[PDB]
């Protein structure tokens, strides 16, 4: 099972991915992923328990969450895998990612409503149910709130950071995890959520299917970092309050540890690494 750059999918792969996502939404399964993520986003805090975000487990937690979602996709269509969006390469509103045969484009200026693609509210196939902003249609403002996506040079600067994470293991940390997450530095992952806008900029960001392709690329960058720094590994490694240590299990699953997730090749490979 190979995760491919979105820019390379065939028409058939795009069709099958879209259909499987829309079936997970139809059946009610999709919205429970949105709900799980929102609960962690709203509970993880820099001075208290933190698991999904703003913490060393940001990367293995999103790895397992994306595996849960890919497994659900595969239960509808076993050929489908999660594609990734290299936002350092495919950085304009003109990328085929945002075409009507894939995710559809940006929102209209009046109310941010996405008007084309399979997830536009007018299709009847993508109600926004799990929400805080009361509106029930997918919204985006590509490039609205921040002008540019991160560049390859910026990604490279973060990939060169040797330490995985550092105390205090939160949004103030130095180290790779927090620079990739983006709370410090040139800002990679947080800035992409802000760039897409709409629900992707909120606490219910998996409402936009681009969520998965963004995090699949963030997950790819972790794998690339591992290759660059084979003498560097997940920290902390035991006895840290409020923080998932290497061999501690992670909510919500409780049955998996960061240790079980460091090597993606047990689950999937990339088209190229």
């Amino acid at each position: 099972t190979v995760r491919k750059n979105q820019a390379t999918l065939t028409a058939d792969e795009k069709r099958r991915f879209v259909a499987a996502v829309l079936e997970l939404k139809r059946s009610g399964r999709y919205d429970e992923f949105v709900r799980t993520h929102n609960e962690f986003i709203m509970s993880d805090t820099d001075s208290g328990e933190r698991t999904g975000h703003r913490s060393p487990s940001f990367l293995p937690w999103h790895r397992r969450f994306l595996l849960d979602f890919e497994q659900a996709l595969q239960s509808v269509d076993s050929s489908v895998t999660l594609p990734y969006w290299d936002w350092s390469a495919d950085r304009t509103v003109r990328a085929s990612l945002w075409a009507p045969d894939f995710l559809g484009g940006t929102g209209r200026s009046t109310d941010g409503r996405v008007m084309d693609g399979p997830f536009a509210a007018s299709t009847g196939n993508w109600p926004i149910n799990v929400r805080v902003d009361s509106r029930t249609y997918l919204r985006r403002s590509l490039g609205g709130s921040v002008a540019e996506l991160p560049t390859r040079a910026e990604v490279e600067s973060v990939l060169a950071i040797s330490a995985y994470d550092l105390p205090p293991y939160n949004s103030a940390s130095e180290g790779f995890r927090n620079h990739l997450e983006g709370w410090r530095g040139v800002n990679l992952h947080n800035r992409v959520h802000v760039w897409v806008g709409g629900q992707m900029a909120t606490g219910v960001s998996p409402n936009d299917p681009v969520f998965w392709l963004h995090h699949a690329y963030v997950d790819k960058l972790w794998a690339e970092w591992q290759r660059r720094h084979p003498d560097s590994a997940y920290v902390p490694t035991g006895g840290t309050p409020d923080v998932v240590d290497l061999n501690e299990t992670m909510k919500p699953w409780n049955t998996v540890r960061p240790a079980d997730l460091l090597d993606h090749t047990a689950y999937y490979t990339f088209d190229a690494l």
Partner: protein
């Protein structure tokens, strides 16, 4: 040590803040009387659940950012 309270009309909407499936908030914000979940980061900045990835300096700034995001829409409670 929590920020001061505030109360103003911003873009036609009432935003209020006060020291006090989601976190431990020592500060509460409201938009037209509906509570907006907000959070403080280690460096002192704030975010809210409708602008979670874009830290702003203060809870009033987070309330204003939420009003900007909502484009008139009522907030749903958390």
């Amino acid at each position: 040590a929590a920020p001061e309270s505030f109360d103003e009309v911003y873009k036609g909407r009432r935003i209020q803040g006060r020291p006090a499936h989601e976190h431990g908030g020592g500060y509460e914000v409201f938009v037209d009387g509906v509570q907006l979940h907000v959070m403080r980061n280690a460096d002192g900045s704030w975010i809210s659940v409708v602008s979670h990835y874009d830290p702003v300096p203060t809870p009033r700034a987070a309330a204003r950012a939420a009003v900007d995001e909502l484009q008139g829409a009522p907030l749903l409670p958390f």
